[PDB]
Enzyme design. Sequence first.
Site, PDB file in Angstrom:
ATOM      1  N   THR A 246       0.834  -1.191   0.000  1.00 42.26           N
ATOM      2  CA  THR A 246       0.000   0.000   0.000  1.00 42.26           C
ATOM      3  C   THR A 246       0.872   1.246   0.000  1.00 42.26           C
ATOM      4  O   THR A 246       2.050   1.224   0.373  1.00 42.26           O
ATOM      5  CB  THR A 246      -0.897   0.106   1.245  1.00 42.26           C
ATOM      6  OG1 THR A 246      -0.085   0.141   2.425  1.00 42.26           O
ATOM      7  CG2 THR A 246      -1.882  -1.044   1.321  1.00 42.26           C
ATOM      8  N   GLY A 247       0.256   2.344  -0.402  1.00 36.57           N
ATOM      9  CA  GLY A 247       0.885   3.643  -0.320  1.00 36.57           C
ATOM     10  C   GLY A 247      -0.197   4.673  -0.107  1.00 36.57           C
ATOM     11  O   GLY A 247      -1.357   4.302   0.081  1.00 36.57           O
ATOM     12  N   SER A 248       0.145   5.957  -0.173  1.00 36.83           N
ATOM     13  CA  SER A 248      -0.808   6.990   0.216  1.00 36.83           C
ATOM     14  C   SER A 248      -1.942   7.184  -0.790  1.00 36.83           C
ATOM     15  O   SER A 248      -2.978   7.753  -0.425  1.00 36.83           O
ATOM     16  CB  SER A 248      -0.080   8.311   0.468  1.00 36.83           C
ATOM     17  OG  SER A 248       0.936   8.515  -0.493  1.00 36.83           O
TER      18      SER A 248
ATOM     19  N   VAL B  80       5.353 -11.162  -9.194  1.00 38.96           N
ATOM     20  CA  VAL B  80       6.748 -11.465  -8.910  1.00 38.96           C
ATOM     21  C   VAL B  80       6.788 -12.091  -7.523  1.00 38.96           C
ATOM     22  O   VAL B  80       6.761 -11.390  -6.506  1.00 38.96           O
ATOM     23  CB  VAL B  80       7.635 -10.206  -8.987  1.00 38.96           C
ATOM     24  CG1 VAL B  80       9.101 -10.604  -8.889  1.00 38.96           C
ATOM     25  CG2 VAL B  80       7.376  -9.432 -10.278  1.00 38.96           C
TER      26      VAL B  80
ATOM     27  N   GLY C 209       8.823 -11.569  -3.606  1.00 42.90           N
ATOM     28  CA  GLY C 209       8.712 -10.464  -2.667  1.00 42.90           C
ATOM     29  C   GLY C 209       9.878  -9.501  -2.774  1.00 42.90           C
ATOM     30  O   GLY C 209      10.693  -9.553  -3.692  1.00 42.90           O
TER      31      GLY C 209
ATOM     32  N   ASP D 201      14.621   6.070  -7.959  1.00 38.42           N
ATOM     33  CA  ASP D 201      13.859   5.424  -6.891  1.00 38.42           C
ATOM     34  C   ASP D 201      14.475   4.095  -6.463  1.00 38.42           C
ATOM     35  O   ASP D 201      13.769   3.211  -5.972  1.00 38.42           O
ATOM     36  CB  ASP D 201      12.399   5.230  -7.330  1.00 38.42           C
ATOM     37  CG  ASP D 201      11.377   5.241  -6.175  1.00 38.42           C
ATOM     38  OD1 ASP D 201      11.715   5.491  -5.004  1.00 38.42           O
ATOM     39  OD2 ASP D 201      10.190   4.979  -6.482  1.00 38.42           O
TER      40      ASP D 201
ATOM     41  N   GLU E 174      13.580  -1.776  -0.856  1.00 38.76           N
ATOM     42  CA  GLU E 174      12.128  -1.773  -0.764  1.00 38.76           C
ATOM     43  C   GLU E 174      11.457  -1.805  -2.122  1.00 38.76           C
ATOM     44  O   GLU E 174      10.291  -2.191  -2.195  1.00 38.76           O
ATOM     45  CB  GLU E 174      11.653  -0.499  -0.056  1.00 38.76           C
ATOM     46  CG  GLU E 174      12.046  -0.333   1.414  1.00 38.76           C
ATOM     47  CD  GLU E 174      13.360   0.369   1.662  1.00 38.76           C
ATOM     48  OE1 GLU E 174      14.368   0.114   0.952  1.00 38.76           O
ATOM     49  OE2 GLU E 174      13.406   1.152   2.640  1.00 38.76           O
TER      50      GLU E 174
ATOM     51  N   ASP F  87       8.749   0.242 -10.059  1.00 40.22           N
ATOM     52  CA  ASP F  87       8.225   1.565  -9.747  1.00 40.22           C
ATOM     53  C   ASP F  87       8.851   2.618 -10.653  1.00 40.22           C
ATOM     54  O   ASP F  87      10.075   2.773 -10.670  1.00 40.22           O
ATOM     55  CB  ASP F  87       8.540   1.910  -8.297  1.00 40.22           C
ATOM     56  CG  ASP F  87       7.879   0.983  -7.293  1.00 40.22           C
ATOM     57  OD1 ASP F  87       7.060   0.096  -7.651  1.00 40.22           O
ATOM     58  OD2 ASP F  87       8.199   1.161  -6.100  1.00 40.22           O
TER      59      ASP F  87
ATOM     60  N   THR G 245      14.697   9.035  -1.406  1.00 45.14           N
ATOM     61  CA  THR G 245      14.633   8.535  -0.047  1.00 45.14           C
ATOM     62  C   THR G 245      15.925   8.946   0.638  1.00 45.14           C
ATOM     63  O   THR G 245      16.988   8.837   0.021  1.00 45.14           O
ATOM     64  CB  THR G 245      14.481   7.011  -0.081  1.00 45.14           C
ATOM     65  OG1 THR G 245      13.243   6.698  -0.739  1.00 45.14           O
ATOM     66  CG2 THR G 245      14.456   6.395   1.302  1.00 45.14           C
TER      67      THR G 245
HETATM   68  N1  LIG Z   1       4.369  -8.656  -8.031  1.00 44.29           N
HETATM   69  C1  LIG Z   1       4.353  -7.518  -7.978  1.00 44.29           C
HETATM   70  C2  LIG Z   1       4.343  -6.084  -7.860  1.00 44.29           C
HETATM   71  C3  LIG Z   1       4.401  -5.495  -6.594  1.00 44.29           C
HETATM   72  C4  LIG Z   1       4.459  -4.106  -6.448  1.00 44.29           C
HETATM   73  C5  LIG Z   1       4.557  -3.497  -5.098  1.00 44.29           C
HETATM   74  C6  LIG Z   1       4.491  -4.296  -3.958  1.00 44.29           C
HETATM   75  C7  LIG Z   1       4.595  -3.739  -2.696  1.00 44.29           C
HETATM   76  C8  LIG Z   1       4.770  -2.375  -2.550  1.00 44.29           C
HETATM   77  C9  LIG Z   1       4.865  -1.550  -3.662  1.00 44.29           C
HETATM   78  C10 LIG Z   1       5.169  -0.055  -3.465  1.00 44.29           C
HETATM   79  C11 LIG Z   1       6.619   0.063  -2.958  1.00 44.29           C
HETATM   80  N2  LIG Z   1       7.567  -0.345  -3.990  1.00 44.29           N
HETATM   81  C12 LIG Z   1       4.233   0.537  -2.392  1.00 44.29           C
HETATM   82  C13 LIG Z   1       2.819   0.677  -2.921  1.00 44.29           C
HETATM   83  O1  LIG Z   1       2.775   1.461  -4.123  1.00 44.29           O
HETATM   84  C14 LIG Z   1       3.551   0.859  -5.162  1.00 44.29           C
HETATM   85  C15 LIG Z   1       5.013   0.735  -4.778  1.00 44.29           C
HETATM   86  C16 LIG Z   1       4.747  -2.116  -4.935  1.00 44.29           C
HETATM   87  C17 LIG Z   1       4.433  -3.323  -7.604  1.00 44.29           C
HETATM   88  C18 LIG Z   1       4.342  -3.901  -8.862  1.00 44.29           C
HETATM   89  C19 LIG Z   1       4.311  -5.292  -9.027  1.00 44.29           C
HETATM   90  N3  LIG Z   1       4.289  -5.864 -10.296  1.00 44.29           N
END
Ligand SMILES: N#Cc1cc(-c2cccc(C3(CN)CCOCC3)c2)ccc1N
Lengths: 19, 353
Positions: free
Chosen positions: B54-56, B126, B129, B169, B173, B187, B204
């Site tokens: 999640t994010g904002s 993916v 994790g 970025d 994380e 991202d 960051t």
């Molecule tokens: N599989 C997979 C997958 C997972 C993410 C993902 C997962 C956990 C958190 C996040 C964020 C921190 N990088 C936090 C939330 O907003 C996006 C960025 C992204 C993104 C794209 C994907 N294709």
Amino acid sequence: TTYADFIASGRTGRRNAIH
Amino acid sequence: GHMGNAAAAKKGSEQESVKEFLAKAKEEFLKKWESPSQNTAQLDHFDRIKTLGTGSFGRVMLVKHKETGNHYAMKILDKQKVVKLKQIEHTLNEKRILQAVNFPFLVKLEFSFKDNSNLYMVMEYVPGGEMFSHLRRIGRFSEPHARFYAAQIVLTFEYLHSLDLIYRDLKPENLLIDQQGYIQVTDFGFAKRVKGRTWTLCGTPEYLAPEIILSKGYNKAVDWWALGVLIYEMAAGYPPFFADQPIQIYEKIVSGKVRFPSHFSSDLKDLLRNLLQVDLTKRFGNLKNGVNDIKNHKWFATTDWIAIYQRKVEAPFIPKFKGPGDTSNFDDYEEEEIRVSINEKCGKEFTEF
Ligand SMILES: N#Cc1cc(-c2cccc(C3(CN)CCOCC3)c2)ccc1N
Ligand SMILES: [Cl-]
């Protein structure tokens, strides 16, 4: 130790981007 | 010299072949950048399974395509929250980049669509994790393990920079591990087309280059600084610059001083001193020889760059995998319903999505 200083920073979890 | 005839000829040929690859890759990127894909699926095509992060203003969920049973990761953005948080341009730009790039370590956008309330990007799932979790759990990665990941970032940045994309970025994380143990970069909200310089304060604290902190115009060299931070953190288990408060981190970053664990090899320390170089006229990745100063460094002497690109190197670490749809390698998040309003919100601003 440097590791203990890292723990002491409180910044061991996921870090947010600024603003 | 450092190379005999055969080795020098082989290195020269390899470097010329990279130029040839990148020229073709740029032509392909520019075609897709000018003619983007759009509106390739719909929400009721997928079962929503679990939140992966999640994010904002958005969340990413594991979903299952109903007809095929294939799993994907779906990023859901709330249009009204995107507007409120001043993220319209970043959101449109991220989708445009994802549609146009093609590289084995960049996540693939499989579908995208929108409805009255939200924007949706359906990407590869993916399952390994975030690197962050594995790094904190294991503590630190051995140098060969850190090097395997670093090599993938080097190639990915060589690709992105050839397209004039700065990444901005990088951190554990934001790196995922796939079922074969290779990296996926997902991202692109902070990425920007920059052939020259740009000025936005973004990133960051631990990963910010000095020239960003100091409010300078900056260039793609900030990504090479961030690579130094990442390699250091992978190999040490903690980043080179940390403190209780960001301002103290920034003072350390700009100081020109960095200290290393006693277990770091001399080759690693040399590479890191050249990446974590405050002086832009001296930073590896920003000199006349470009990325080759990094790729030809002694710390990478055992790295077969083509074999990494071809994914023919056995990975040092294979995440646990119970099967398709296994989410064990992501954190648990509070689940929230996906409300689609009866009234379209923010149509004009997202016409291009
Ligand atoms: N599989 C997979 C997958 C997972 C993410 C993902 C997962 C956990 C958190 C996040 C964020 C921190 N990088 C936090 C939330 O907003 C996006 C960025 C992204 C993104 C794209 C994907 N294709
Ligand atoms: Cl955390």
